[PDB]
């Protein structure tokens, strides 16, 4: 019953969502959280009748500061996900104690995965503020001012809107789901 | 000569590419066409990660080989 386009009116297909994913995501991670440490991970899923399924959060192996964390061994993710024929549908990611956005960095980061899936969403916790916030960018406007952009430092801001939340009802849709979370940390 | 770089996500980039040409050459080239910058691709073939000064032809990469690409996360 609902369908949702792009601010150019290309057609999105729906993500499911698993409703328990955010709380087991900050559970998982929660001890960076309590070191001050950010931490990330990869939605992973499946497409079934023009639809996509979120299956599996996947913590891949990274480092991490207070504000920042990347991956470090993506061979290791890539080989799970082959192996799996899990699809990448987005990312989420801690801001310990800063407010729910998109950083510059969460920018730059977000505009590739939704270059390569146009659903790609971007789930930001912000557990010292209790919120949270599922973002893309706007399409195609914020997606070509971040491919042009050249700017250098890490906080540089953008002309324009660049980002957006996902709409309710949406594209994102949050349903009882089962999921498996898989940690390839040490 | 063509070759492929499948995703993670159910997309296939086709390049234009030769032999001689370097790893960081066809990141580079994902760029021109795809918008990704270099510094967040990872290229796998036959199993291995390429290496940027290394050549297509280096790793046996061939007329209609298939590579893989993984993306780099950042939160900053
Ligand atoms: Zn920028
Ligand atoms: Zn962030």
Redesign the interface.
Same mark, same amino acid.
């Given at each position: 019953k609902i369908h949702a386009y792009t601010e150019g009116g290309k057609p999105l297909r729906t993500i499911y969502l698993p409703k328990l994913l955010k709380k087991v995501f900050l559970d998982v991670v929660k001890p960076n959280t309590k070191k001050n440490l950010?931490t990330?991970g990869?939605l992973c899923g499946k497409?079934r009748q023009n639809a996509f399924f979120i299956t599996h959060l996947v913590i891949?192996l990274?480092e991490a500061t207070s504000?920042?964390?990347? &991956?470090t061994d993506?061979?290791s993710?890539?080989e799970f996900?082959?192996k799996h024929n899990?699809? &990448?549908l987005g990312?989420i990611? &801690?801001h310990p104690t800063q407010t729910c956005f998109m950083?510059?960095?969460?920018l730059? &980061?977000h505009?590739?995965?939704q270059?390569?899936?146009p659903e790609?969403i971007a789930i930001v916790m912000a557990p010292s503020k209790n919120t949270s916030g599922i973002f893309r960018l706007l399409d195609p406007e914020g997606?070509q001012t971040i491919?042009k952009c050249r700017k250098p430092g890490?906080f540089h801001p953008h002309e324009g809107k660049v980002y957006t939340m996902v709409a309710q009802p949406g594209h994102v849709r949050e349903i009882n789901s089962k999921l498996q979370v898989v940690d390839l940390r040490v | 000569m063509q070759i492929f770089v499948k995703?993670?996500?159910? @997309?296939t980039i086709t390049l234009e590419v030769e032999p001689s040409d370097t790893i960081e050459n066809v990141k580079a080239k994902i760029q021109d066409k795809?918008?990704?910058?270099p510094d967040?691709q990872?290229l796998?073939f036959a199993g @291995?990660?390429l290496e940027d000064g290394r050549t297509l032809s280096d790793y046996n990469i061939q007329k209609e080989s298939t590579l893989?690409?993984?993306?780099?996360?950042?939160?900053?």
């Open positions: 950010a990330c990869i497409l891949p990274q504000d920042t964390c990347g &991956t993506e061979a993710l890539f996900q082959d899990l699809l &990448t990312w990611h &801690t950083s510059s960095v969460d730059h &980061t505009c590739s995965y270059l390569m899936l790609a997606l491919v890490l | 995703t993670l996500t159910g @997309k795809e918008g990704i910058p967040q990872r796998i @291995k990660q893989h690409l993984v993306l780099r996360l950042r939160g900053g």
